[PDB]
Homo-oligomer: A and B are copies of this chain.
Amino acid sequence: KPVIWTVSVTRLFELFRDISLEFDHLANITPIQLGFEKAVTYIRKKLANERCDAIIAAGSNGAYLKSRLSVPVILIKPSGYDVLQFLAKAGKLTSSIGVVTYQETIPALVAFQKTFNLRLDQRSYITEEDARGQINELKANGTEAVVGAGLITDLAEEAGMTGIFIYSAATVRQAFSDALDMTRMS
């Protein structure tokens, strides 16, 4: 069976665990709960003794791993199209939604907001202080739900809004399937 190591923390780690149960019969999956240099060091030391066919990771962590490992890294990056799907499924697409993302907004989401005159208030952040202020601003304008990664979803919940984790089950499931497909291609 293909060997897959997932690298994640917190909510994403929880989601990866949930979804990997669907692929246990197709892959030998080992969860790694690290990031960045510590993950690189662990993975490189692990690779001295055992093979790995693919790593699955997300965001800034996964982008860093992808440029530093010669093992294939399937990088999860949320699209506006998956966000819109998660929203519309939950019937929240026509509600007061906030989206706060690291470094930049999502152009597919910015565009859909443009065309459909929806209430999707899209913001970016770099630091925790940045993220806190964007959350406080969304709270203060009646926003009911905020889409983002771990820090943003947590902050949103503490602020009394719905936190919608930007990585859906569907996008994680796709990443497992892509790792299997890639492995099959070799």
Say if the beta carbon of A40 comes within 8 Å of chain B.
no
Number of interface residues of A (CB under 8 A): 28
- Which of B54, B81, B111 meets A79, CB within 8 Å? B81
A93: B residues at CB distance < 8 A: 112, 115
**Contact yes or no, A185 B72, CB < 8 A:** yes
A74: B residues at CB distance < 8 A: 185
Which of the 9-residue segments A20-28, A82-90, A125-133, A135-143 touches chain B? Answer: A82-90
**Contact yes or no, B115 A85, CB < 8 A:** yes
Say if the beta carbon of A108 comes within 8 Å of chain B.
yes
Say if the beta carbon of A94 comes within 8 Å of chain B.
yes
**Contact yes or no, B72 A88, CB < 8 A:** no
Quickly give the copy total for this chain: 2
Residues of A whose CB lies within 8 Å of any CB of B are 54, 72-74, 79-81, 84-85, 88-89, 91, 93-94, 108, 111-112, 114-116, 170, 174, 178, 181-183, 185-186
Known: A73-B185, A81-B112, A91-B115. 20 other contacts (CB 8 A): A54-B185, A72-B185, A72-B186, A74-B185, A79-B81, A80-B81, A81-B84, A85-B108, A85-B111, A85-B112, A88-B111, A88-B114, A88-B115, A88-B116, A89-B111, A93-B112, A93-B115, A94-B115, A181-B182, A182-B182
A116: B residues at CB distance < 8 A: 84, 88
CA distance A72 to B183 in the complex (A): 11
